[PDB]
């Protein structure tokens, strides 16, 4: 069936800018394209149908165009309430298909993450578990790679990551990484390392501790 692609899944823009979100169809969909806006709270609203027709109640700054396979949504004079995710959708053939979506975000100056690592708590260890936690707080842009090492070699099993949405006040992002092990495995090794790689520096930010120095 028809594949809908939005080549940009995250898009940076400032308030008052002219934002353009693109959408490509795998074949001619004859202007049978609709645009939807999903807010962080999950709610969804229709903006435009049949390429260019404005749904009732939608501000005029939302504009749609395109033909054949390529279509686009243009938002002039971006406002705070416009920060959301935008999905295109073809109604030419069955089954109906959506694009992956494009979540807008607020531009700001680059900021390096502040990194903190934490050994397992006494409470948890007495339960037979061991989780090592690493926060990477208040960084921008949101792309970041975290890497765990045990005794100097990389570890990826047991690692579960969580990312916050863009902060509403300072526009930064924050991330938590947790490496979970058994008490016994944790006690067979010494050095636990959290390495953060971010465009603010070519060299990773390294935080680590040693069990034998505890």
């Amino acid at each position: 069936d028809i594949q809908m692609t939005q080549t940009t899944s995250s898009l940076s823009a400032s308030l008052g800018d002219r934002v353009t979100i693109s959408c490509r169809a795998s074949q001619d969909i004859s202007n049978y394209l609709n645009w939807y806006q999903q807010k962080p709270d999950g709610t969804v609203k229709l903006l435009i149908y049949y390429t260019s027709r404005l749904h009732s109640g939608v501000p005029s700054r939302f504009s749609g165009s395109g033909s054949g396979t390529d279509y686009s949504l243009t938002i002039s004079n971006l406002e705070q309430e416009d920060i959301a995710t935008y999905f295109c959708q073809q109604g030419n053939t069955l089954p109906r298909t959506f694009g992956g979506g494009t979540k807008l975000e607020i531009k700001r100056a680059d900021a390096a993450p502040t990194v903190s690592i934490f050994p397992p708590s006494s409470e948890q260890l007495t339960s037979g578990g061991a989780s090592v936690v690493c926060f990477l707080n208040n960084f921008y842009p949101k792309d970041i790679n975290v890497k765990w090492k045990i005794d100097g070699s990389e570890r990826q099993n047991g690692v579960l990551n969580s990312w916050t949405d863009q902060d509403s006040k300072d526009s930064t992002y924050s991330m938590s990484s947790t490496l979970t092990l058994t008490k016994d495995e944790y006690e067979r090794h010494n050095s636990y390392t959290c390495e953060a790689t971010h465009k603010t520096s070519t060299s990773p930010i390294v935080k680590s501790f040693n069990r034998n120095e505890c």
């Binding site: 999905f87 397992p120 948890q124």
Partner: protein, 224 residues
């Protein structure tokens, strides 16, 4: 005013079934089709199928036809979607939406708030709240970050604060993740080194489903 109120959140064990609702108001129920859309964190939106409440005609996406069944209740203006043989792949948010005709096309002009489905054998379980102090070997700075690990609870949500709200700035509570059928989240708070450990720092995590209210204190670690 057109409105589509969907049913509440669902917790169902895999291999079982579920039937969620979508009550329509503010318009003629029989004059518009009802479409169903599936959303999982990292894909976007999928069209399951649609039903015509007037004649009960249904068209399914072949991906969902085997396990999905769409029906309506014309006496209550309510559409139903049944999902059978549930797996973890069916954990998503499910929306209903009304479709309107234009130029031969159809488009979804009004959506419901969405129904969350979590496929899991877990039962209500309070979290284990673990305090996260800096490593004893660590030498902190003028600002010291403290944490709190909220591990092994079910279901969402959890409410985390620091000193019962009196520490508002420099707090990051992260979205939950799924381990083995259970949830885990964390939270950080950053305070001046003159504040901790000279004063108390406490994370307060609340889990309404289990009627739990845990206050955990962040104390310096024992050396050795």
């Amino acid at each position: 005013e057109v409105q589509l109120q969907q049913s509440g959140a669902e917790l169902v064990r895999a291999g079982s079934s579920v039937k969620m609702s979508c009550k329509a108001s503010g318009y003629t129920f029989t004059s518009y089709g009802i479409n169903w859309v599936k959303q999982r964190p990292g894909q976007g939106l999928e069209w399951i199928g649609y039903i015509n409440p007037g004649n009960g005609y249904t068209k399914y996406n072949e991906k969902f036809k085997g396990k999905t069944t769409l029906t309506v209740d014309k006496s209550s203006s309510t559409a139903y979607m049944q999902l059978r043989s549930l797996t973890s792949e069916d954990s998503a948010v499910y929306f209903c939406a009304r479709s309107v005709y234009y130029g031969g096309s159809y488009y979804f002009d009004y959506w419901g708030q969405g129904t969350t489905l979590t496929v899991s054998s877990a039962k209500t379980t309070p979290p284990s709240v673990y305090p996260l102090a800096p490593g004893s070997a660590a030498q902190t700075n003028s600002m010291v970050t403290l944490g709190c690990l909220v591990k092994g609870y079910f279901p969402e949500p959890v409410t985390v604060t620091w000193n019962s709200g009196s520490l508002s700035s420099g707090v990051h509570t992260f979205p939950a993740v799924l381990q083995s059928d259970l949830y885990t989240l964390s939270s950080s708070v950053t305070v001046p080194s003159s504040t901790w450990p000279s004063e108390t720092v406490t994370c307060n995590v609340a889990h309404p489903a289990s009627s739990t209210k845990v206050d955990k204190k962040i104390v310096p670690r024992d050396c050795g």
